[PDB]
Amino acid sequence: KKAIQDPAFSDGIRHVMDGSLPTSLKHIISNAEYYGPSLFLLATEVVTVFVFQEPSLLSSLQDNGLTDVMLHALLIKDVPATREVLGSLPNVFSALCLNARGLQSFVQCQPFERLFKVLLSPDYLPAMRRRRSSDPLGDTASNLGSAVDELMRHQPTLKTDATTAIIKLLEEICNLGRDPKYICQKIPIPLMDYILNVMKFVESILSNNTTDDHCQEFVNQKGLLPLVTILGLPNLPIDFPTSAACQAVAGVCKSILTLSHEPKVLQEGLLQLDSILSSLEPLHRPIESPGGSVLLRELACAGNVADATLSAQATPLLHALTAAHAYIMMFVHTCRVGQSEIRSISVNQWGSQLGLSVLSKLSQLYCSLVWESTVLLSLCTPNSLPSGCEFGQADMQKLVAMAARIKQIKPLLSASSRLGRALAELFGLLVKLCVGPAARSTASALTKLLTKGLSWQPPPYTPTPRFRLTFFICSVGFTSPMLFDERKYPYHLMLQKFLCSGGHNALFETFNWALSMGGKVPVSEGLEHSDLPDGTGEFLDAWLMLVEKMVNPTTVLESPHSLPAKQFSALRFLVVTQKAAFTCIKNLWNRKPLKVYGGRMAESMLAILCHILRGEPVIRERLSKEEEEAKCLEKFQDADPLEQDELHTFTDTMLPGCFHLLDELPDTVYRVCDLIMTAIKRNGADYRDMILKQVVNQVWEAADVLIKAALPLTTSDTKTVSEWISQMATLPQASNLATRILLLTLLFEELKLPCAWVVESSGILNVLIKLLEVVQPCLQAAKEQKEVQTPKWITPVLLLIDFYEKTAISSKRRAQMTKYLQSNSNNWRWFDDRSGRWCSYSASNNSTIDSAWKSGETSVRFTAGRRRYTVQFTTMVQVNEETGNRRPVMLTLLILIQGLTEDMVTVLIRACVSMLGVPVDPDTLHATLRLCLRLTRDHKYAMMFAELKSTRMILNLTQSSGFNGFTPLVTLLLRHIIEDPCTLRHTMEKVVRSAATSGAGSTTSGVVSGSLGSREINYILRVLGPAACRNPDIFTEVANCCIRIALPAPRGSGTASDDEFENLRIKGPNAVQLVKTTPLKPSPLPVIPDTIKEVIYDMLNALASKPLMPTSTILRLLAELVRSYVGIATLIANYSYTVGQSELIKEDCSVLAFVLDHLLPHTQNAEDKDTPALARLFLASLAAAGSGTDAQVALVNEVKAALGRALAMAESTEKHARLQAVMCIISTIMENNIIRLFLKKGLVNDLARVPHSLDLSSPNMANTVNAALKPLETLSRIVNQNIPTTHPLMVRLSSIPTALTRWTEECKVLDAESMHDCVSVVKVSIVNHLEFLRDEELEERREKRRKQLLLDHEALSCLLVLLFVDEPKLNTSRLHRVLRNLCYHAQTRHWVIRSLLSILQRSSSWLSVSMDAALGCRTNIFQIQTVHIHPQAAPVVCRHVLDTLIQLAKVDFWDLLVKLDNMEASPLGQLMNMLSHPVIRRSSLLTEKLLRLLSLISIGLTENQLQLSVEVLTSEEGLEDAANVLLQLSRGDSGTRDTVLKLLLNGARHLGYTLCKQIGTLLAELREYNLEELQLPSMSMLTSKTSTQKFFLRVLQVIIQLRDLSLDELWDMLGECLKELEESHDQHAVLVLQPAVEAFFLVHATEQKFLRFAETHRTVLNQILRQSTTHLADGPFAVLVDYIRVLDFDVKRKYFRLRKEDMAVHVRRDHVFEDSYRELHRKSPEEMKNRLYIVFEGEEGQDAGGLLREWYMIISREMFNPMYALFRTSPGDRVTYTINPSSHC
Amino acid sequence: SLWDRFS
């Protein structure tokens, strides 16, 4: 098979099938049971591949009947049942048909009737089973189908018969599904496996190329009936419709629909569905007696059959249900189609007379199945739901103690439930298709279903009302998806038909019925009645959730799914809906809530009220602006609008109910705020005030009663321990506050200033602060009980206070902003970063933006150039709605809330720290820390917060008392404590300078490192806004002192004219005020206050149920602190611990020394996991912080001392860990003054001398040495070269963060949108100063114009000792780089190189480097008695030293070494002399490395002779290296050229003489072998890889390579021996002289004896060349180009073997000879040399190589057709051909 | 998802 598919047989493969081969393939194919199936497949595949390489010779395969045996073995005889054979049969038939005669024979024998029988046979099911449980279901059926599809696509005549056989398979499935005698297994028959495989097959066949020719043929041959009938098959199982087989049938039908656009698939399904729905009408008819389910009266009455549900006669209605389910799982699949045309034909089919007959019967089926499912479910319930009645018991007594009945009922109910689910999916998707003429009737029938479900009433015998309520819930559950889309927008067609047809009056009648219980109780009393049915809350939850969607004007009016204009009004629909809903809500407004489903009821009821209260404005405005279908719509058009006087009185009286809901169901409070807000936005401030004052009076009394609840318990009447502590948390007042405060806070957040002024004027803040002060003792006690239980009302209060002072801040900032703005035509301007201009908006845009900003809207929309822009005043960004480009904006500048007074702040801070002491709760800690963060932004209060020892509490906090934002927030608080006026000033200077100097990027598309946009003062102040908010006064002082507006160069000299326009330009209203920094003023370091040092020290001590601030967190925080503030770095570096301050402390030691020693090293037992990395971060921060010498010098000194300590440590894993960690710190810190210090401190020396103070034999030595080399390498080179925005209750290294980012986050949290107001006040203040200074500097400028040895020997020795030791894990490469970087220094280079050479020579207790050199003995590398290397170790020391020397080349020691243990071109001579020394001369490896070194360096008599001896007696690499060395040296000198050539010639002569002393033995032994194959032992010493032949050839090659020797006796011997060898039988016997023969040609035939030898050895030189791939005309044998008789044919063929294009040749199959003559005979030779591809007119495509070969074959035949008279057969031979002497005709 | 009550 491979050869047939391979060239080099394509010429000649025709003669495979005229051999015996087909007679043996015929037997393998004929005996697929004796030979394996794999072998059968292989044989068929071979024939197939031959038939595709040479289809002509398919006729020969037909002549000998191999194809006729294949047909019989693949069709008539049983196919061997395996995946590959089935997968291959159609490709075989694609071959056997290829001759047209084969096609006839193939179609003669009914091939597809046999081939497709495979799919209905259990013998082949194991072949069909998915392989690996990974490939698709039916993968083998799909593959077979695709193969058959290809076969038909090539041979279209078969299409008609294939689909004829396909329909027969479907028909056969139907028969095996129709008769009773078979039973589907999971007589048993695998009907679902057959169905699945057939459907996957027919899917591939029908829909592969999407040609639609197969779909059309199949549909026109009536195959869709047999297809769609498979769904309805009686004996298919109950679980069929959900199964893969059903999906496969649906997939086939969908494929037909999509690929044919044919309605016929749905029509027939509907016909059969209509047939099935008509069968199960007994499901619609109830018992008409005390009775339960019809399914359970058909089951129970099925005699005593063990499994009735498995028989279609035992359970006709259940099997019919499953048939319906199968049909309905196909219409779902065909509706899930996005082609508007397929969708349109789906709608058309559904809206037909048959479509609507089916849809009516499906609607009645739906209501029957909801009834039956709720009955069977209630019967399966364990005698709880029914009222002790024989409702369905009479049939359960036939069915049958409880488990068995429930376990028979359960299958039935799973059939009903799943059918219903599928049918609801169909109706829902049909609504989508209907919406997006016949659609209108489909929607009519679906809304008639909705009406039927809502107005359905059960039989009077129903035992309990819960059967109707559970029906109603499902009905209400079903109308909501069908009236409203996902995203809650309605379909106006469906609302139209739901209104006109009915279902709105029935929806609200179902509400009235559910509350009144059928009229037993009025609706206004129903909800509160004790005997309300159990399921009336679930119904009312679903009803309210539906009506919430129905009432919302923002979706009912704005729905994308509106009808077109030409009639429905959504306005009158909302009028009638809001009017109907309001009364029902009245009937539920204030009554107490239900046990379950009472908070969802309340929340949807409040949402309905909100929508109504918002809508009656909009609805009234639009109302003012303003056969059956028309009549009903007109009736509902005359709809009374909901009275405006009724919503008024409602909003008046609603608050008692709102507060009842807040007492019963706190979680509703978020919707009550919104309800109150809409009533407020309906009514005036006179109503806002009444609301807020009433809420505040509720808070007031609840707070004053809790203040009276916590008076200290002097008299002991109550327990005073458990009761008082839990009374604060559990009194009703303390449940009220938790919602009255939260409501007041939400109201405050919306109504910012009215509610601020009311909270101020009520004094409620005083009372709340007093209550906070009073609670603290109770909390502390509880902590002393170890039973803290936090009063939940604490978090609302702190949040209220938070938003009160946020609000006061902003108003003051806004007030002084208003004081600096004209209220008329405030100019908004948008920033052009590219030009740097604040360009104005149009007047209409400016007025719109201003008006909507003044309203306080978060965003404003406007259009410019038809582009849509929106501004976001949270961010002050204009977004282009098309592109999303965000651009900055500004406002161009030209009820006073006192806020929390000093006493309040002091008390609040004390209460906060008390709450931090007792870990009150996560959310309460979050609120109190947020409040502290807002308060402590004044340093006075940060000092207060830090003097009460709160950082200790914060460090003590456990993970039980932690929250997402804890560590950010704590970091910000600590920064607020650290930022004293002076440290804040210096840090603000740093931030301002950094931001002005660096063109920072932003989320406003401000180009990074821009020079226009990134540098404007008006933008930089916007970036620095967080800094202005941090402290505006200090920020003014800093910006006035550190900023100056730039002066642009003098445009033109001359005062009269140029300066007039330079004042016009620089000072113009529209200008580009770029910024320059002032030169740095020599700021002194701010002295750190002592309390800030009792804050920093407590964290440093915290370095020394899990803790919430572990060491890792503290280290990160400290790193940030050090990065931002340099005082912190100096303090930490100076700091030191004290004896017995912590368990880990042994004596007075620095913080840094501890971090390096105790925390930094990796240790296998965790305390905190990532402490090492963060400690590394901390130390890197401390180093990077310049801090002059205070931090850097201390750090370097401590690192050094730490290295020393780790060294002197006793040998242990702990020492190694410490050392490695310290080296990593050094590397990190290094990666420039720190490097200056490392040099000054001698850290390079210590690192190098690390070896000395380590064990060389330790296992962990290589890792620590690698670690110490890493900074040595770097240093030698360098020398010698979270925060949640809103509290959860309210709502519904460069890794180190910079100071500006922290301030930004703080600003966001504390004051999200009020930052800009400050940026503006500060901007005005600053600019009124910087422009003055710009004009003064400009005047000054005009006036001035008008007036006009790294390492010492010892350390290097230790490095060489590392070079000596044998450690695989040791990074030799790193050591080599270190040594090279050290050897850039000349003195160091000299010492190193010389020492290495001395080590080499000598090669040929700390120093106890034992090496496992030998099997029995471990040898010490150093024998010290004057230091010797044990000769067993020498080859290793040599190897390492040679590597090092090669690296240096690419770019005393002993006495020092014992002093330790007791505690290019000049040395080329020595290296060459080392070739003589035995350890090197033995080893191939060492010799090669030495030769490599010599070659690299190369870029006297004895030394050159040593080199020549190497090649003479020994490594292809070594050979090349020796050649290079000799060549380069020869180029070095002429006298050395001569001496080397002489020595090489002498070596060659000696080698030849020894060779001749070998060939003489060979010849003699060949004489003695013959004179009485060749394995003469004399041949062995020529076969040898190291034979003198090899050496001789190598030497000769080098001699020639130098040319730009008397050996006639050897030549004669070689000749004689070759002749004797050739005389012998064996041919390859010559090859043992190939190298010597090569040598002869190398010597002779200089760039003749050679020719004579080659002739007398012709077949030998041919064996040479034939074996050689050396190209004849580039090697030495080129000379014989001209004497050609001396080569073999195939040698000359190998030697033998214009841009060329591809080129077409158009010829006719019947004229090829003459068509080619016409096309080509005038073509040029170079056009012929193009690659020809042949096209035969109208013939199919074929292999161009095969088509050319065929063309050549036909031509080579026609040459010898007598009709052309070109060639005639020799009258003697009669098979040859010569020129026809009769071609003159 | 409204028929989950039976299942």
Give the per-residue SS3 of A1170-1216. CHHHHHHHHHHHHHHCCCCCCCHHHHHHHHHHHHHHHHHCCCCHHHH
Count chain A–chain B contacts defined by CB atoms under 8 A: 26
CB A1333 within 8 A of CB A1045: yes
Q: Which chain B residue lies closest to A373 (C-alpha atoms)?
A: B6
A1493-1520 burial, b at 16+ Cβ within 10 Å, e below that, comes to bbbbbbeeeebbbbbbbbbbebbeebbe
Chain B nearest CA to A383, separation (Å) = 17
d(CA A841, CA A899): 37
Chain A nearest CA to B1, separation (Å) = 8
Q: Which chain A residue lies closest to B4 (C-alpha atoms)?
A: A417
Taking CA A1700 as the corner, what is the angle to CA A1696 and CA A1706, rounded to the nearest 5 degrees? 115
CB A807 within 8 A of CB A749: no
d(CA A163, CA A173): 15
Contacts of B2 in chain A (CB under 8 A): 424, 473-474, 477-478
| Cα distances (angstroms) measured from residue A450 to each of A255, A364, A477, A498, A570 | 32, 11, 10, 8, 19
The sign one gets for the Cα dihedral A177, A180, A186, A189 is: negative
Chain B nearest CA to A325, separation (Å) = 15
Inter-chain CB proximity B6 and A478 less than 8 Å: no
CB A97 within 8 A of CB A115: no
| B7 closest CB neighbour out of A417, A470, A474 | A417
d(CA A1115, CA A1117): 5
Chain A nearest CA to B7, separation (Å) = 7
d(CA A1143, CA A1551): 82
Tokens (6 digits) for A1700: 């060329």
Where on the phi/psi map is residue A1319: left (φ > 0), alpha (ψ -120 to 50), or beta? alpha
Inter-chain CB proximity B2 and A424 less than 8 Å: yes
CB A171 within 8 A of CB A113: no
Q: In this complex, is the C-beta atom of A414 within 8 Å of any C-beta atom belonging to chain B? A: yes
CB A1255 within 8 A of CB A1211: yes
- DSSP H/E element including A331: helix A316-335
d(CA A1488, CA A1515): 7
Tell me the sheet residues that pair with A864: A867
Helix and strand numbers (H, E) in chain B are 0, 0
> In a 10 Å sphere around its CB, with 0-12 CB exposed, 13-18 middle and 19+ buried, how is residue A1603 labelled?
exposed
d(CA A211, CA A207): 8
d(CA A576, CA A1648): 122
Inter-chain CB proximity B2 and A470 less than 8 Å: no
CB A1207 within 8 A of CB A1163: no
Which residue has tokens 């070969």?
A: A1749
Q: Residue A1519 carries which side chain, given as an amino acid letter?
A: L
d(CA A871, CA A869): 7
| Cα distances (angstroms) measured from residue A1607 to each of A7, A420, A1595 | 48, 106, 14
| B6 closest CB neighbour out of A413, A424, A478 | A413
CB A1436 within 8 A of CB A1366: yes
Tokens (6 digits) for A452: 């039927």
d(CA A1046, CA A1072): 9
Which of A421, A469, A546 is most worth mutating to test chain B (most B CB atoms within 10 A of its CB)? A421
Inter-chain CB proximity B2 and A477 less than 8 Å: yes
Q: Spell out the alpha helix ranges (H) of A1284-1314.
A: 1299-1310
d(CA A472, CA A1222): 75
Inter-chain CB proximity B5 and A413 less than 8 Å: no
Inter-chain CB proximity A377 and B3 less than 8 Å: no
Which residue has tokens 């929106």?
A: A870
Pairing of the two strands A183-184 and A188-189? parallel
Which residue has tokens 């001369």?
A: A1481
Inter-chain CB proximity A421 and B3 less than 8 Å: yes
CB A1199 within 8 A of CB A1192: no
- Backbone φ and ψ for A832, nearest 5 degrees, come out as -95, 95
Residues of B within an 8 Å Cβ radius of A: 2-3, 5-7
Helices A794-818, A1315-1347: crossing angle, 10 deg rounding: 40
d(CA A1633, CA A1559): 9
Inter-chain CB proximity B3 and A413 less than 8 Å: no
Helix and strand numbers (H, E) in chain A are 84, 18
Tokens (6 digits) for A1388: 């160091």
Q: Residue A277 carries which side chain, given as an amino acid letter?
A: L
Can you list the pairs that A953-958 forms with residues at least 24 positions away whose Cβ atoms lie under 8 Å?
A: A953/A913, A953/A916, A953/A917, A954/A916, A954/A1109, A955/A1098, A955/A1099, A955/A1102, A955/A1107, A955/A1109, A955/A1114, A956/A1107, A957/A916, A957/A919, A957/A925, A957/A1107, A957/A1108, A957/A1109, A958/A919, A958/A1105, A958/A1106, A958/A1107, A958/A1108
Tokens (6 digits) for A1133: 């570096």
- Whose CA is closest to A1525, among A1577, A1564, A1468? A1468
Helices A139-154, A191-206: crossing angle, 10 deg rounding: 40
A1119 three-class SS: helix
| Cα distances (angstroms) measured from residue A1037 to each of A736, A1043, A1322, A1632 | 49, 10, 10, 98
Which residue has tokens 């804050």?
A: A1095
HEC profile for A16-40?
Answer: CCCCCHHHHHHHHHHCCCCCCHHHH
Q: Residue A345 carries which side chain, given as an amino acid letter?
A: I
- Whose CA is closest to A584, among A680, A512, A653, A483? A512
Which of A466, A474, A541, A543 is most worth mutating to test chain B (most B CB atoms within 10 A of its CB)? A474
d(CA A281, CA A234): 18
Chain B nearest CA to A281, separation (Å) = 22
CB A1269 within 8 A of CB A1275: no
- Whose CA is closest to A987, among A1041, A1043, A939, A1034? A1034
Reported resolution, Å: 3.3
d(CA A1707, CA A994): 80
Q: In this complex, is the C-beta atom of A428 within 8 Å of any C-beta atom belonging to chain B? A: no
Distance between start and end Cα atoms, chain A: 48
Chain B nearest CA to A377, separation (Å) = 7
Pairing of the two strands A1731-1736 and A1702-1707? parallel
DSSP A949-989: THHHHHHH-BGGG--TTHHHHHHHHHHHHH--HHHHHHHHH
Tell me the sheet residues that pair with A923: none
- Whose CA is closest to A1598, among A1642, A1553, A1554, A1636? A1642
- Whose CA is closest to A921, among A782, A1049, A806? A782
- DSSP H/E element including A870: strand A867-872
Where on the phi/psi map is residue A643: left (φ > 0), alpha (ψ -120 to 50), or beta? beta
Q: Residue A542 carries which side chain, given as an amino acid letter?
A: A
Dihedral of CA atoms A864, A865, A866, A871 in degrees, nearest 10, equals: -20
A189 three-class SS: strand
Contacts of B3 in chain A (CB under 8 A): 373, 417-418, 420-421, 424, 474
Inter-chain CB proximity B2 and A474 less than 8 Å: yes
Method of determination used here: cryo-EM
- Backbone φ and ψ for A1042, nearest 5 degrees, come out as -115, 0
d(CA A481, CA A427): 10
Distance between start and end Cα atoms, chain B: 10
The sign one gets for the Cα dihedral A961, A962, A967, A971 is: negative
d(CA A237, CA A190): 11
A1378 three-class SS: helix
Which residue has tokens 């027969």?
A: A168
A1662 three-class SS: helix
d(CA A24, CA A22): 5
d(CA A573, CA A580): 11
Q: Residue A203 carries which side chain, given as an amino acid letter?
A: E
| Cα distances (angstroms) measured from residue A1301 to each of A476, A889, A973, A994 | 53, 21, 15, 13
- DSSP H/E element including A801: helix A794-818
Residue A80 per-residue DSSP state: P
Helices A1111-1124, A1126-1134: crossing angle, 10 deg rounding: 120
Q: Spell out the alpha helix ranges (H) of A381-465.
A: 393-399, 403-435, 439-455
- DSSP H/E element including A877: strand A877-880
d(CA A664, CA A657): 10
